[PDB]
Every structure is written in C-alpha cells, then in structure tokens.
Amino acid sequence: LLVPKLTASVTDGAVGVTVDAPVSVTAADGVLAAVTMVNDNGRPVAGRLSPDGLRWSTTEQLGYNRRYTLNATALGLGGAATRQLTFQTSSPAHLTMPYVMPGDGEVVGVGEPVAIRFDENIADRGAAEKAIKITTNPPVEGAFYWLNNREVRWRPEHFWKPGTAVDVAVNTYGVDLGEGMFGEDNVQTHFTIGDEVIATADDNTKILTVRVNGEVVKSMPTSMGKDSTPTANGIYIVGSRYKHIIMDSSTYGVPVNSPNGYRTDVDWATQISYSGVFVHSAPWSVGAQGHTNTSHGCLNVSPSNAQWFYDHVKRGDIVEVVNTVGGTLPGIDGLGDWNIPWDQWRAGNAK
C-alpha cells in the first residue's frame, strides 16, 4: 500500500519566488487533510482546496518581500505524509505601474492603438511585451512597438475593422521588468472599434473632408499652418477633445514669448498630435480658411465646424494631412503611429 505524496509549486528554502502565479500543493495516493500558508508573522494566506481533496491553491494576491510558510498533510489508505516549506518571494528594487488606453468599455475609431504606458523606464522591454496579452475578435495580426522608454503600443497592419472587440490584459504583477523593477499591479481594459471615420485635409484645396464609412458627410474649409510653421503631412490619430482649452505653446517645448509661442483660449478643440496639433474653432481666420494658411500648425476651421468635429469625431478616428509644405508627422509623436511602415513596426524595438 502506497504512502501519500505531496507536490508543492515551491521548494523549501527557495528565494526570489515570483508572485505572478498562485502557490499550489497536490496530493497523490491520497488526499489533502490540512493545508495552511502563513506569512512571516502568522497571518493565514487564504486558499481553497478542490472538491476531490487533491489540489489546494492560494486565492489572493501574494506579497512582494514576504517569507511564507506552507504546511500540508496528505492522508491515504496507506499512510500519512506532512511537509513544511518556507520560501521568500521577490523583493523589488522598484515598482512600476502600467496605465492602459483607451478606456474600459469605450468605443473608439479604426486608428486607435492599444497603449500601455509605464510610469518608469522599462529595462526589459521583452518581458513587458510578454506580460501583455492582447485578444482580438475577429482575430488579427498585430505587434508591439515602443514610442519611448515608458510607453509601448500594439496595433494591426491596417486600420481596424469596425466591430472588432479588443481585450488587453497587462499581467505585470510579479514580473521582473528588468534591473529589479517589478510590476506594481495588473491592469485590464476592453474596447470596441466603431465606425470608420477618416478626415482628410488637402493643402491644395484647404478643405478638411470628413468621411464616415467611405461617404463624405462634411466639408470644412480650413486654415492650416503657415509656411514658417507648417502642418506636417501624414496620418494623425484623434485623441482628446475639449469644449474649450487654453493652448499653451510651453506645453510643447516652445516658450510663450518666443517668435512661435502662443497662449490662447480656443473652443471646440480636438487633439490630433502630442506635438500640439488640434482641430479647433478660429473665428479670427474664417476669412483665410479655404484660401490661405495662417496658423501655428493647427487646423483652424469655423466655430460650427469645430463643434461638429467635437460631436461627430471620436478618439481613435483618423485625420490625414496631405500636400502641405511640411514634413511627415513623426512615427513616435504619440498620435503618429500609423506613419511607421508596417515592416519596421512589426520587427519592433524590444532591444
């Protein structure tokens, strides 16, 4: 007759046991009569034993920098076995919290990338990528690309298909993200892609034309950036929107009282670059809109048109600017992700 056998997911004496997984204990040739786990001043850890008595597991988050002790006994027809195991979990040098966009339960446009922004520089980009599980339905190929040391993005090759569900599980709790930096917590979000909405600003016509699922629904005369401060060409992702906002050039590197600085309150503002390009109300230039460029790079349009754009365009919709004298919007702007060729995006930069 067989002696019961105990198998724990930790070994007695271990150090740097990671806290991304539950701790478990299994009986063979018998059943579990007692399992307790206790931290280093006696508080019980909390867990659940399967109905068949074979498998026990912790049910709550385990702590960084803890010394836990696990006592288990198995009883069988042919005897008893008891073990005591003591182990120490990872003690980070630092913690980093991830922040995910877009918002949970949001409906976003077809240009919206998955964004995971860490509040510290990530030394092991690959470990971060690996901890982030993205589910798509319908499934589509995508890839990670890092905009800077803290923020990674995931997206498909092409604009999302309307009706796609996107799920993002950032499972960074207990993960060593490099040089003793570990995840502070897990985060989750789920969003859905909505209608296809692409607004094109053509500098040859000075019109911003808004297309919803391939159809023109609005034509907006506009005044883009003057030759000395032109609007960059390329694909811009729509971000945040404001009933009114004080636009302050010092927010974007540029001192208010320098030659290209400004501080002005404007209405009906939709952000389309982190470099500070917005679509907004410009009563002062209604004359020029349709004819000449007068701005610092913003898409000046009429008050009714900026408000229309506020109401009808959402986060993740697209604006494409073409034929200006400017360059191309940088890939790494923050809202310029689609300007990076797919082959480069896909190869990634996890080193």
Do 21 and 114 lie in one domain? The reply is no
Task: Count Cβ atoms below 10 Å from residue 272 Cβ, excluding itself.
Answer: 29
Q: How many domains does the chain have?
A: 3
Do 109 and 146 lie in one domain? The reply is yes
Instruction: Check the annotation: does 176 bind a ligand.
Output: yes
Q: What is the resolution of this structure in A?
A: 2.2
Domain boundary among 60, 90, 120: 90
133-to-79, 105, 136, 143, 190 alpha-carbon distances in Å: 44, 17, 10, 11, 12
Do 177 and 200 lie in one domain? The reply is no
CATH number at residue 235: 2.40.440.10
Task: Count Cβ atoms below 10 Å from residue 211 Cβ, excluding itself.
Answer: 15
Q: How far apart are CA 276 and CA 296, in angstroms?
A: 10
Task: Report whether 108 contacts 335 (CB < 8 A).
Answer: no
Which residues have CB under 8 Å from 137's CB, separation 6+?
A: 164, 165
Which phi and psi angles does 119 have, rounded to 5°? -80, 10
Domain boundary among 36, 58, 90: 90
Instruction: Check the annotation: does 64 bind a ligand.
Output: no
Task: Report whether 190 contacts 133 (CB < 8 A).
Answer: no
Do 102 and 117 lie in one domain? The reply is yes
Task: Report whether 164 contacts 188 (CB < 8 A).
Answer: no
Q: How far apart are CA 220 and CA 122, in angstroms?
A: 43
Tokens matching residue 228: 């000395």
Look-up of token digits 């701790």: 23
Q: Is the peptide bond before 138 cis (omega within 30 degrees of 0)?
A: yes
Task: Report whether 203 contacts 224 (CB < 8 A).
Answer: yes
- Asked whether the CA dihedral 328, 331, 335, 341 is positive or negative, the reply is positive
Which residues does residue 153 pair with via DSSP β-bridges, in sequence order? 115, 145
259-to-256, 265, 294, 296 alpha-carbon distances in Å: 8, 18, 14, 11
Instruction: Check the annotation: does 180 bind a ligand.
Output: yes
Q: How many CA atoms lie within 13 A of 292 on its CB side?
A: 5
Q: Any idea what the Cα angle at residue 159 is, between residues 194 and 295, rounded to 5°?
A: 90
Do 172 and 216 lie in one domain? The reply is no
Which residues have CB under 8 Å from 250's CB, separation 6+?
A: 256, 261, 263
Look-up of token digits 């911003």: 208
CATH number at residue 121: 2.60.40.3710
Which residues have CB under 8 Å from 93's CB, separation 6+?
A: 179, 180, 181
Q: How far apart are CA 110 and CA 337, in angstroms?
A: 13
| CA-atom Rg of the chain in angstroms | 27
Q: Among all residues, which ones are annotated catalytic?
A: 280, 298
Do 95 and 151 lie in one domain? The reply is yes
Q: How far apart are CA 125 and CA 349, in angstroms?
A: 8
Specify the DSSP element, H or E, that contains 28.
strand 24-28
Q: How far apart are CA 338 and CA 345, in angstroms?
A: 9
Task: Report whether 123 contacts 181 (CB < 8 A).
Answer: yes
Q: What is the DSSP string of 222-259?
A: -B-B-TTSPPPBEEEE---EEEEEEEEGGGGT--TTST
Do 233 and 262 lie in one domain? The reply is yes
Torsion of CA 119, 98, 102, 62, to 10 degrees: -160
Domain boundary among 90, 123, 143: 90
Tokens matching residue 302: 């009429």
Do 186 and 203 lie in one domain? The reply is no
Tokens matching residue 210: 């808004």
Task: Report whether 338 contacts 277 (CB < 8 A).
Answer: no
- Asked whether the CA dihedral 140, 147, 337, 335 is positive or negative, the reply is positive
Q: How was this structure determined?
A: X-ray
Tokens matching residue 2: 């067989």
117-to-64, 153, 281 alpha-carbon distances in Å: 22, 9, 31
Tokens matching residue 100: 């995910």
Q: How many CA atoms lie within 13 A of 65 on its CB side?
A: 8
Instruction: Check the annotation: does 194 bind a ligand.
Output: no
Do 219 and 324 lie in one domain? The reply is yes
- Which residue segment(s) compose the domain that 44 sits in? 1-90
Task: Report whether 128 contacts 217 (CB < 8 A).
Answer: no
Instruction: Check the annotation: does 13 bind a ligand.
Output: no
Do 199 and 319 lie in one domain? The reply is yes
Do 227 and 310 lie in one domain? The reply is yes
Do 30 and 69 lie in one domain? The reply is yes
